[PDB]
Amino acid sequence: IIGGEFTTIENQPWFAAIYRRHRGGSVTYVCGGSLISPCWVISATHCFIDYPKKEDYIVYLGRSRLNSNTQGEMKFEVENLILHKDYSADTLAHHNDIALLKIRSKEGRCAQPSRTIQTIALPSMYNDPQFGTSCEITGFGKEQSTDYLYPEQLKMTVVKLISHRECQQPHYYGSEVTTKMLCAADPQWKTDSCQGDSGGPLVCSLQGRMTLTGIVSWGRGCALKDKPGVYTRVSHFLPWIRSHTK
Numbered sequence: 001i002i003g004g005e006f007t008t009i010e011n012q013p014w015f016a017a018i019y020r021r022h023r024g025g026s027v028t029y030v031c032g033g034s035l036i037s038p039c040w041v042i043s044a045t046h047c048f049i050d051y052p053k054k055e056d057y058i059v060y061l062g063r064s065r066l067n068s069n070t071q072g073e074m075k076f077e078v079e080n081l082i083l084h085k086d087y088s089a090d091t092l093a094h095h096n097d098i099a100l101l102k103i104r105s106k107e108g109r110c111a112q113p114s115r116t117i118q119t120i121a122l123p124s125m126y127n128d129p130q131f132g133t134s135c136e137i138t139g140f141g142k143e144q145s146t147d148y149l150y151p152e153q154l155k156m157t158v159v160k161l162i163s164h165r166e167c168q169q170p171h172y173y174g175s176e177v178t179t180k181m182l183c184a185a186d187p188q189w190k191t192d193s194c195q196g197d198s199g200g201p202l203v204c205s206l207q208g209r210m211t212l213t214g215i216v217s218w219g220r221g222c223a224l225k226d227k228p229g230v231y232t233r234v235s236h237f238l239p240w241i242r243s244h245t246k
C-alpha cells in the first residue's frame with residue numbers, strides 16, 4: 001500500500017496473510033486474501049501459479065504483522081488450492097485472476113471467528129457501487145515502488161472506483177481492462193495498491209454492508225498518474241465461487 005495509514009487486523013478482520021515455505025526451510029510472504037467462510041479464503045491465481053503445490057503454503061488469520069506473531073492469530077495448512085481454469089496473463093493484465101484456498105489447521109479445524117477473525121460478505125451478482133464510490137484496500141505490499149522490503153505492519157487506504165469508460169481510455173489501460181475487472185484510484189494518484197498487495201480485499205459499503213467488491217490483481221507500477229489499480233470484479237464470479245465452495 002502506497003500512502004494510506006497503518007492499521008491492525010481488527011479493522012479488516014477478514015484479511016488473510018498467505019506465505020510459502022521454501023525447500024531451504026525459509027518462509028516468505030506471498031499475497032493477501034479474504035476470509036469468505038470459515039473454511040475458505042479467496043485470493044488471486046497469479047499468486048500461486050508458479051508454485052501450485054498446496055503443501056507449500058501457510059495461511060494466517062488474525063495477523064497484523066508480517067514477521068511476528070499477533071495475539072489471537074490462527075495458522076492453517078491449505079487443504080485445497082483452486083486456481084481459475086481460464087486464468088491468463090499478458091505482459092500486464094491478469095484475466096480471471098481469482099483463487100480459492102480451503103484452509104485446515106493441524107488439528108483439522110477451520111477458522112473460529114473472534115474480534116480479529118471475521119468473514120466478509122460477497123456482493124450480489126452484477127451489483128457494484130457506482131463510479132466515484134470510496135472503497136478500502138488492505139495489505140502488506142510495498143509502501144513505495146522502489147522499496148525492497150515489505151512493511152512489517154498491515155496497511156490500508158481508500159481509493160475511488162473508476163468507470164470502465166475512463167479506465168479503458170488509451171492513456172489508461174485500453175482493452176487490458178475487461179468487464180470482469182474494476183479499476184480504482186486516488187484523484188491525486190497519491191495512494192494505491194502495489195506489489196505484495198495482490199490477492200487482498202477491495203471492500204465497499206453496498207446496501208448497508210461491507211462487501212468484497214474486488215481482489216487486488218494488477219497495475220502498471222504503483223500510484224502512477226493515469227494507471228489505476230485493477231481488481232478482479234468479484235460480482236462477476238459468484239457461480240465460480242459457489243461451485244468451488246459448495
Ligand SMILES: NC(N)=NC(=O)c1nc(Cl)c(N2CCCCCC2)nc1N
Pocket residue numbers: 192193194195196197198216217218219220221222223224227228229230
Ligand atoms: N495498483 C497498482 N498500481 N498496482 C498493483 O496493484 C500491482 N502492482 C504491481 Cl507492480 C504488482 N506486481 C509487480 C510484478 C507483476 C505482477 C505481480 C506483482 N502487483 C500489483 N498488484
